[PDB]
């Protein structure tokens, strides 16, 4: 029409019902002919697929829908792969959080030792799906929000350098939404921003409206008193941005920087017996990964309780920009190679890009200050050592990765944490030499 064929890898997730829903709302600006679900376990996806099946029939029945665990069925004749796989699922996420916490160290999905562990699990999963895409639809793009994006992006850069995969993250979008609310704008798309960093590790340097008016002084005065909370708890993520932002008053921070600049505050935010993976399993998981069972039985929308995930509109914005060559400016994770002049050219950086049908065209950042440089060189080193550990099957390189982390207080605690993660992750990591 032109209409696009899409496969969601990680169909038995609890995000997918929310995004099929969002994909249906965005059908005018991004039309679909085929939507397939891919997962390795049939019975999780089937039960998700039954509710998606109902949605598709209500709003756009002429879309071909199928759920499958067979790679060839899934990845043949698609234009885009939307990947949100979680190797090890929430059970491993729980351990990623809890193991470090036992030692007084930040326990978090993508930051600190929990992030490194998840990274080690994820690399293999993402490479698997990417190879299926290249084997069955060589010209499709993979839009990967499968975390932790910084480590996975470094893996693909090294191990699959020519592949059409874009690693992406919704945090900046979420923060920009709150910025737009603070400024009285109808939408974040009314702002034109400059930004640099690593994934979950960056700064806005310039924010203006379409006319070129500077919005930054207004945002800074607000954020320096309230964080990213619109006018209407010191350690809540968005409130806490106020403390992070004072480290560098000329910019505005990614909220994830709290885990690095105030690690010991964050250690005590999580219940060590009942972490965020447990708050997600009660809140969502069994909530929707079996209100889908009702929607399948009924075979209707109920005035349904599963909300439209309007936060995942950014994945559709990206697919659109590639499909119709819109040239929209978006923050993506790409190989630096000069975008940040005075930073490792081989690093994956999160920077504004003009997105078109050939992929992103990164915009130059120029020279960055010493504060951000130092922080980013340390952190990228953690991510690069983690990928080296994975590719070389090296225990030593992984230990070095933990030693380097700003969240880890010393090399002995680094080793203790590593020995515990090795044990917890035996089914999901490659076997490491020297000497687990
Ligand atoms: N980068 C971002 O901005 C961002 C934002 C939100 C969520 N996420 C990521 O989205 C993913 C999904 O999150 P969720 O909360 O819905 O988790 P989830 O466990 O509900 O979804 C994961 C699904 O992936 C499937 N899966 C796991 N390993 C697989 C494999 N090897 N092959 C095929 N399928 C596999 C699992 O069966 C599960 O159904 C996670 O990686 C999460 O970190 C990323
Ligand atoms: O704890 P959750 O509800 O799973 O949130 C975790 C998610 O937060 C988002 O804002 C980040 O951009 C994702 O990278 C992350 O995976
Ligand atoms: Mn993210």
From Swiss-Prot:
Keyword Flavoprotein attributed: no
Gene3D superfamilies: Lactate dehydrogenase/glycoside hydrolase, family 4, C-terminal, NAD(P)-binding Rossmann-like Domain
Residues binding Mn(2+), per UniProt: 169, 200
Induction, as annotated: By maltose; repressed by glucose.
Marked site: Increases basicity of active site Tyr: 109
Cofactor requirement: Mn(2+); Fe(2+); Co(2+); Ni(2+)
Family as reported in the entry's similarity comment: Belongs to the glycosyl hydrolase 4 family.
Protein name: Maltose-6'-phosphate glucosidase
Lineage: Bacteria, Bacillati, Bacillota, Bacilli, Bacillales
């Amino acid at each position: 029409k032109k209409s696009f064929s899409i496969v969601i890898a990680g169909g038995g997730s609890t995000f997918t019902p929310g995004i099929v829903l969002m994909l249906l709302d965005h059908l005018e600006e991004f039309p679909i002919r085929k939507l397939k679900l891919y997962d390795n376990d049939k019975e999780r996806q089937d039960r998700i697929a039954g509710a998606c099946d109902v949605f598709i029939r209500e709003k756009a029945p002429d879309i071909e829908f199928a759920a499958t665990t067979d790679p060839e069925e899934a990845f043949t004749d698609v234009d885009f792969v939307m990947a949100h796989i979680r190797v090890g699922k929430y059970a491993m996420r729980a351990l990623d959080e809890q193991i470090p916490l036992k030692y007084g160290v930040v326990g978090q999905e993508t930051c600190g030792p929990g992030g490194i562990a998840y990274g080690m699990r994820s690399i293999g999963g993402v490479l698997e799906i990417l190879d299926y895409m290249e084997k069955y639809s060589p010209d499709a793009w993979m839009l990967n929000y499968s975390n932790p994006a910084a480590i996975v992006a470094e893996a693909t850069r090294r191990l699959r350098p020519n592949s059409k995969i874009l690693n992406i993250c919704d945090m900046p979008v979420g923060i920009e939404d709150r910025m737009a609310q603070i400024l009285g704008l109808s939408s974040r798309k009314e702002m034109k921003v400059r930004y640099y960093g690593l994934n979950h590790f960056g700064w806005w340097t310039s924010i203006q409206d379409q006319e070129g008016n500077d919005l930054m002084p207004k945002l800074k005065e607000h954020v320096s008193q309230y964080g990213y909370i619109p006018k209407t708890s010191w350690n809540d993520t968005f409130a806490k941005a106020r403390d992070v932002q004072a480290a560098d008053p000329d910019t505005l921070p990614n909220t994830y920087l709290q885990y690095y600049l105030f690690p010991d505050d964050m250690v005590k935010k999580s219940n060590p017996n009942h972490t965020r993976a447990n708050e997600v399993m009660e809140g969502r998981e069994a909530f929707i990964f079996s209100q889908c069972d009702m929607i399948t039985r009924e075979q209707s929308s109920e005035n349904s309780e599963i909300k439209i995930d309007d936060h995942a509109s950014y994945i559709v914005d990206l697919a659109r920009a590639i499909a119709y060559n819109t040239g929209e400016r978006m923050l993506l994770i790409v190989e630096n190679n000069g975008a940040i002049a005075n930073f490792d050219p081989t690093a994956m950086v999160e920077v504004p890009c003009i997105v078109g049908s050939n992929g992103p065209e990164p915009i130059t950042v120029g020279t960055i200050p010493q504060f951000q440089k130092g922080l980013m060189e340390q952190q990228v080193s953690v991510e690069k050592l983690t990928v080296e550990a994975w590719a070389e099957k090296s225990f030593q390189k992984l230990w070095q990765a933990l030693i380097l982390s700003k969240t880890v207080p010393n090399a002995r605690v680094a080793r203790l944490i590593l020995e515990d993660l090795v044990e917890a992750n035996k089914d999901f990591w490659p076997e490491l030499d020297q000497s687990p």
